[PDB]
Symmetry: D3
Subunit: 60 residues, 6 copies
């Protein structure tokens, strides 16, 4: 099981470390899969690179 | 926040529903983001489509 | 330029053909890039495989 | 409907804003889906990270 | 090192097994990384789901 | 045929150029597909962005 998470840039290294752990755990729990097989990738998006309804998230 | 999870095929609909909920929650908690903005995509892989060390996981 | 579009299953082949064309055009226009270089991938999601707010889109 | 677009680095913020809008619109039109549900992600590639025919795009 | 490869549907299981092996090896060689860490995912695309120049590959291809 | 490869940051431009070529070749060989149709994307990951067993690769 491999998870890729796209998020807006701006968060601390600690928050991201937590995200990885908590998501990894949730995956292991939910699928009864061994925690050590779980991979997580975080991909940060620039605010000018993410659109909702055709408009940037950097003015919503 | 949009999460795509690749997993081996073979799990039940219930397990997957759970995966979606628990992961969505963990994201919301971890980033202090509203739960309703979180999207999750599950992508099932066939066992013949996933390699480790150059060999199928189906072996 | 390569675009991948995740959409809920259930649309017609014609709608998807249109999607491919219209998006490919929009990319070419926007970036002043040659239309023939543009690649588009459509990835259909099962309704039981897409979550919003932790709950399936096949409820909401 | 969630679109991810990989493009070469080098474009202006305005061009990208236009890309997001025009693509979002093309998606909404093509699938008769509400514009406000459409998400777009732009992922910029470094010129040394994109290959065609095994050769960098930064010698093309 | 994790590779995802999108290909048109239609190939045999053997061809895909080969693809996985040859690509994993090329990755290991190129990056001096241990072969056993390399992951590969193959994702098959339906011919109606892949566009070139705004037109399906299933009307520009077999 | 379009390949995206996620790798840890830290490698030289030459190594990556080699990765692109060798992988592109392997794909062409394996699928009997024309080399010039093969696309490769390299995506570098920061060490703080990649988790194994819930822990950073650092
Ligand atoms: C990951 C980004 C999602 C949002 O910001 C939102 O929809 O509110
Ligand atoms: C592409 C998925 C998003 C929706 O359909 C929506 O939330 O409206
Ligand atoms: C990987 C699919 C692409 C083609 O078929 C091509 O570019 O000719
Ligand atoms: C890319 C796959 C994982 C690793 O690099 C590792 O095993 O550290």
């Amino acid at each position: 099981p491999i998870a890729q998470i796209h998020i807006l840039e701006g968060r601390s290294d600690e928050q991201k470390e937590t995200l990885i752990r908590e998501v990894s755990e949730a995956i292991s729990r939910s699928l009864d899969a061994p925690l050590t097989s779980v991979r997580v990738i975080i991909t940060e998006m620039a605010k000018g690179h993410f659109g909702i309804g055709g408009e940037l998230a950097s003015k919503v």
